[PDB]
């Protein structure tokens, strides 16, 4: 409910106050999705002006990952304490979206960490926020993800949703057709076998009858 | 409730306090939330809770071994069993803030009887 | 707070109770019962239920405590690990009569569940609702309110088979494949609706809702389901075990046919 | 000869029969009554079950009374400490020569059985530290237990 | 008019009980109608009983030649299938429960008894036959219900049977269809001796109008449990006992071949049923794999 509270608080604010509200939104805990804030006209109006840095920061927090704050570090404003942790959590979510068994090396590289203890503590505190759910295997150095939240989307990604839902629908339809075909074939086999058995019995009975001569 | 002995009886009281909201403005809510939900209590939170405690509540049977300090360790070890599939001694000790030999001993004690 | 795993036997018990009480009086009445189950930490599982006797004096209804104690003593003999959890009733939204009865129930158990079943509903979903009591201080007195909980239907092969047999009411492979043809037909008719909504939002037919289009993205990302390397060794272990069992079954049937043919042959072509 | 089950059973009877008649043998009888109840690893603490209450504790022999307690608690440290401190007074006796090795081998067995409960792969030098024995002794004890 | 059966008419029941049609014809009762709640409760109790035999009593009435059953309550007794008239061991419970039920609108009288046969089919053994004779002598009308929970799970179909015995000294005429059932070796004798002394009723199930609505609304979250459940891992221990019994049956089959009527065909019939159940357990998993693990990019 936090994001709609901030949006209502930002109905008319613009300029410096809007940038301050953007920073407070990025720092506020529990807000891991910023898509309704981005749809606001005044928020998108920051491109024309000297505040395009905050719009870039919001875009990075909505669709980007932590390594992207490795090449735009100079242009972007300074990042706070909790903001970096939130970006790292969103990077973990982005990694878990693709693969369900994230190796430790990948997390260490993209999250820019040096120790295993620090990485495991970050993953544990990300789990405690209920953005991802999973278990840590240390003998094999894997993070096994059972559930993760859906991050923000652009207008050019919905086509992918349609593409991957069409495959599922077609697979279900093809499974149903195969099931019906198997049922039909089995019924035909049973009927043919009992017709053949009854015909053999009828032939034997006829032979027995004509044998009485 | 937090200082009480382990069991289901204390668990019911923990759930009752958690359902209350007036408890959100208390200084010990940050530890009740982790105690009821089976989370890991770090060192600093326990230090703050002990600092805010009263001297008579800080029982310390036998050689120090403060009872609260042992219960928090046994709760952290139990809570780490849901996040990890298998944990090394050198990093189970660094997670509970104890030497590795102590971590192995506590894990064996809890695994033996019935607690893990 | 807690997680509730309901059982369909409880719902059948409530429905039978209400139908029995209505058929014996010619007018619908409100019924009261009690729920028994198992709780493990923060996971409450309602398993069975029984009836309770209530006396309505003036305008307040009370629950007879001695009758409930008798019923508890009776049922502890049969089910030993099952314990009291809460009560159930029939009606619409929670009412002051319900919140008054909940106090008497709470006098027995610290945290009793409340279940409400609407026998005359108008929506397309199950009318069962679960509540838990939350107390609060306001305006200088303590008021007890109801907080809704989300429940899930529990899993058991015997219970599922019984429920399916009761719901349906009328080759052995053409009768097993139909039980799996009526569950895929329900998943397909939902995935198709979600796809239609996504396409409608794309082309533009309904207001752009971000939450739905994010949950749909997560649902799409959830596939494939557990394609790890260890899975396609247990799956193939099971497949090969069943294949070997089938191989031995065919060998046995062929031996039976062998014996039948040999017996039929050593009658005609016998010269000894 | 060492086989004394016949006297082991008769110890309980002689505790009362010769209590007021076998005065010269009373000093040695009270020490030996503990052994008979001690060999079956059962019988709680014979310190106060029967009519031996007037005797209870004796000032010169106190660790002898706590020997059965240490055996019941299966604490090797108490047993070894009692043996080293009170030597020549608990061990002095003859009949204890034939039974001291039997006694201080059924504590190590229970300690080792409890020790291996949570493990799936254990180190022999690690077992050699809990039990105050060398590696060559713990390996033989493991062989005898496994057999 | 579906709920019309739920109405209890005390006067009509008293008249029917007083008349006693069934004492003139031993083949009177032919139909057995069971409510949905009764069947669910019986299956749940039998499953919760584990591998032991659990027993209980069931309430209802009679209508014409049909035996109507509406509810069942479990009994706190153990050791059935070995003691004759086991229910008497909790006879006081019978008084305590029923007298309670009459206070909450449950007016129907005791009509029958049921027990479970975990993993060895539904029929009546010698002890069960004797108990049914006693019940029919002292508690007429009555009916015996036998349930198989393990086979209900394994075969995917409810395995239930309602039987009534013949009075002592009566000779049953013909009636030898003998629909095949797989009986373990250790209990194959009891089936043979006591096979003509009881006859099975025709079992049908009924549900009220509210039960139908709740059950059609329930099939919106309950379709998940169908294609998210594994049958191979559930009854994995059943098709090892079955294979042991089949291998022991083949011993007698081969011993007869070296020389109790054509045991090879019966052994083949058992092997075919076990293998068919095993293959049914794998077809569902293949379907689940085709639906869920094949939608990658
Ligand atoms: Zn039986």
Swiss-Prot record, chain A:
The residue ranges of the PCI domain are 1-150
Q: Which UniProt keywords apply?
A: Acetylation, Coiled coil, Cytoplasm, Host-virus interaction, Nucleus, Phosphoprotein, Signalosome
Q: Does the keyword Coiled coil apply?
A: yes
**Annotated compartments:** Cytoplasm; Nucleus
This protein's GO cellular component annotations are: COP9 signalosome; cytoplasm; cytosol; nucleoplasm; nucleus
| Coiled coil regions in record | 179-213
Q: Could you give a single Gene Ontology term from the biological process aspect?
A: COP9 signalosome assembly
Q: Which domain of life is it from?
A: Eukaryota
Please explain the role this protein plays, according to its UniProt record: Component of the COP9 signalosome complex (CSN), a complex involved in various cellular and developmental processes. The CSN complex is an essential regulator of the ubiquitin (Ubl) conjugation pathway by mediating the deneddylation of the cullin subunits of SCF-type E3 ligase complexes, leading to decrease the Ubl ligase activity of SCF-type complexes such as SCF, CSA or DDB2. The complex is also involved in phosphorylation of p53/TP53, JUN, I-kappa-B-alpha/NFKBIA, ITPK1 and IRF8/ICSBP, possibly via its association with CK2 and PKD kinases.
Protein family according to the UniProt entry: Belongs to the CSN7/EIF3M family. CSN7 subfamily.
What interactions and quaternary structure are annotated? Component of the CSN complex, composed of COPS1/GPS1, COPS2, COPS3, COPS4, COPS5, COPS6, COPS7 (COPS7A or COPS7B), COPS8 and COPS9 isoform 1. In the complex, it probably interacts directly with COPS1, COPS2, COPS4, COPS5, COPS6 and COPS8. Interacts with EIF3S6. (Microbial infection) Interacts with vaccinia virus protein C9L.
- Full protein name: COP9 signalosome complex subunit 7b
Where in the full protein does the shown chain start and end, and how long is the full protein?
10 to 222 of 264
From Swiss-Prot, chain B:
Give the stretch of the parent protein shown, with its full length.
233 to 348 of 406
Q: What do we know about how this protein assembles, alone or with others?
A: Component of the CSN complex, composed of COPS1/GPS1, COPS2, COPS3, COPS4, COPS5, COPS6, COPS7 (COPS7A or COPS7B), COPS8 and COPS9 isoform 1. In the complex, it probably interacts directly with COPS1, COPS2, COPS3, COPS5, COPS6, COPS7 (COPS7A or COPS7B) and COPS8. Interacts with TOR1A; the interaction is direct and associates TOR1A and SNAPIN with the CSN complex. Interacts with STON2; controls STON2 neddylation levels. Interacts with ERCC6.
Origin species: Homo sapiens (Human)
Q: Where is it found, in Gene Ontology cellular component terms? A: cell junction; COP9 signalosome; cytoplasm; cytosol; nuclear speck; nucleoplasm; nucleus; synaptic vesicle
Domain PCI: start-end pairs: 1-116
Location comes to: Cytoplasm; Nucleus; Cytoplasmic vesicle, Secretory vesicle, Synaptic vesicle
Q: Which domain of life is it from?
A: Eukaryota
Q: Which UniProt keywords apply?
A: Acetylation, Cytoplasm, Cytoplasmic vesicle, Nucleus, Signalosome, Synapse
Family (UniProt): Belongs to the CSN4 family.
Q: What is this protein called?
A: COP9 signalosome complex subunit 4
Q: Does the keyword Transport apply?
A: no
The residues forming the signal peptide are none
Query: Which molecular function term from Gene Ontology is one that the record holds?
Result: deNEDDylase activity
> What GO terms describe the biological role, i.e. biological process, of this protein?
protein deneddylation; protein neddylation; regulation of protein neddylation
Curated annotation (Swiss-Prot), chain D:
Query: Its GO CC terms?
Result: COP9 signalosome; cytoplasm; cytosol; nucleoplasm; nucleus
Asked whether the UniProt record includes Phosphoprotein among its keywords, one would answer: yes
Tell me the compartments it is located in.
Cytoplasm; Nucleus
Its primary localisation, in coarse terms, equals cytoplasm
Task: Tell me one GO molecular function of this protein.
Answer: transcription corepressor activity
Cite the entry's keywords alphabetically: Cytoplasm, Nucleus, Phosphoprotein, Signalosome
UniProt KW Acyltransferase keyword: no
* Chain's role: Essential component of the COP9 signalosome complex (CSN), a complex involved in various cellular and developmental processes. The CSN complex is an essential regulator of the ubiquitin (Ubl) conjugation pathway by mediating the deneddylation of the cullin subunits of SCF-type E3 ligase complexes, leading to decrease the Ubl ligase activity of SCF-type complexes such as SCF, CSA or DDB2. The complex is also involved in phosphorylation of p53/TP53, c-jun/JUN, IkappaBalpha/NFKBIA, ITPK1 and IRF8/ICSBP, possibly via its association with CK2 and PKD kinases.
**What name does the UniProt record give this protein?**
COP9 signalosome complex subunit 2
| Entire protein: shown range | 248 to 394 of 443
Swiss-Prot record, chain E:
The record ties this protein, via Pfam families, to: CSN5_C, JAB
* Record key words, sorted: Acetylation, Cytoplasm, Cytoplasmic vesicle, Hydrolase, Metal-binding, Metalloprotease, Nucleus, Protease, Signalosome, Synapse, Zinc
Major localization class: cytoplasm
Family annotation (InterPro entries): CSN5_C, JAMM/MPN+_dom, JAMM_MPN+_peptidase_M67A, MPN
Motif JAMM motif is found at 115-128
Entry keyword Transmembrane? no
Instruction: Report the residue ranges that make up the MPN domain in this protein.
Output: 32-169
One BP term from GO: positive regulation of transcription by RNA polymerase II
Q: Which SMART domains match?
A: JAB_MPN
Instruction: Please provide, alphabetically and separated by semicolons, the GO molecular function terms listed in this UniProt record.
Output: deNEDDylase activity; enzyme binding; macrophage migration inhibitory factor binding; metal ion binding; metal-dependent deubiquitinase activity; metallopeptidase activity; transcription coactivator activity; translation initiation factor activity
**Which EC number applies?**
3.4.-.-
Q: Where in the cell is it found?
A: Cytoplasm, Cytosol; Nucleus; Cytoplasm, Perinuclear region; Cytoplasmic vesicle, Secretory vesicle, Synaptic vesicle
Q: What class of enzyme is it?
A: hydrolase
Give a GO cellular-component term.
Answer: COP9 signalosome
Binding of Zn(2+), residues: 115, 117, 128
Needed co-factor(s): a divalent metal cation
The record's domain comment reads: The JAMM motif is essential for the protease activity of the CSN complex resulting in deneddylation of cullins. It constitutes the catalytic center of the complex.
Sequence similarity? Belongs to the peptidase M67A family. CSN5 subfamily.
**Miscellaneous comment:** The CSN complex is associated with some 'Lys-63'-specific deubiquitination. Such activity is however not mediated by the core CSN complex but by the BRCC3/BRCC36 component of the BRISC complex.
| Name of the molecule in the record | COP9 signalosome complex subunit 5
What is the species of this protein? Homo sapiens
Q: What is the lineage of its organism?
A: Eukaryota, Metazoa, Chordata, Craniata, Vertebrata
